[PDB]
Amino acid sequence: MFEQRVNSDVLTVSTVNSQDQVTQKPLRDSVKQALKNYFAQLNGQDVNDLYELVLAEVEQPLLDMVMQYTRGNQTRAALMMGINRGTLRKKLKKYGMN
Amino acid sequence: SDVLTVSTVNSQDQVTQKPLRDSVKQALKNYFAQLNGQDVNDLYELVLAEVEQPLLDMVMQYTRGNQTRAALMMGINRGTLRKKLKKYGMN
DNA sequence: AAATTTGTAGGAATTTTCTGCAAATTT
DNA sequence: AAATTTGCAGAAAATTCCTACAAATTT
């Protein structure tokens, strides 16, 4: 009765294919494509912060959404993110989301 | 100004960048919509796993398997990098 | 009025980083 | 032959979690 949903198809993005068909593709692929374009627009400059870069680029919307979902409730949000409430405040403050 | 973008196409077949953060936002909106008050429990690890894997994969490709360069580029410790690679069975 | 959340902080638990070196690999 | 990387591990540093409670807010 239940068809398998693979971990990569849990967070997906609408894409358009060669037959103008709208299909869900993994978020993984978005991250992959962004990184491929990032490397391509690098031209040998030195990087030392790529993890923090990506992490910010991904943490901000996550906090935005879980806060919208919990209607400002940091405790449910923390419980739902699977992180400590203090950690959540830290992150929120880090991104000016207070 | 935006370093991490993806390519989008509109109805006129014009291609345009958009921040990765928009993708993440869309994916989460779809996620929250799809579940009806079912409990979400470990969402941070979820997303973090969904994002760390293609990152490791791409930086390891870019550094041709060189963990030291990968780790330096990413700005984390070589041990941390190894740990993460083990975590996702990329070793 | 009662239940929940919020702000806060000291301490414990865990994770990351630092240092350093023998062995293996790449150059 | 030399330089770099790898694998590893004990310790320091940093981060996250736990605990607990008064104050504030929501139900």
From Swiss-Prot, chain B:
GO cellular component terms given for this protein: cytosol; invertasome; nucleoid; nucleosome; protein-DNA complex
UniProt keywords, alphabetically: Activator, Cytoplasm, DNA-binding, Transcription, Transcription regulation
Gene3D superfamilies: Homeodomain-like (1.10.10.60)
Chain segments carrying region Required for the stimulation of HIN-mediated recombination: 10-37
Domain of life assignment: Bacteria
GO biological process: chromosome organization; DNA-templated transcription; positive regulation of DNA recombination; provirus excision; regulation of DNA-templated transcription; response to radiation
Transmembrane segments: none
Subcellular location(s) of the protein: Cytoplasm, Nucleoid
GO molecular function list: core promoter sequence-specific DNA binding; DNA binding; DNA-binding transcription activator activity; DNA-binding transcription repressor activity; protein homodimerization activity; sequence-specific DNA binding; sequence-specific DNA binding, bending; transcription cis-regulatory region binding
NCBIfam families assigned to the protein according to its UniProt record, in alphabetical order: PRK00430.1
Subunit record text: Homodimer.
Protein name: DNA-binding protein Fis
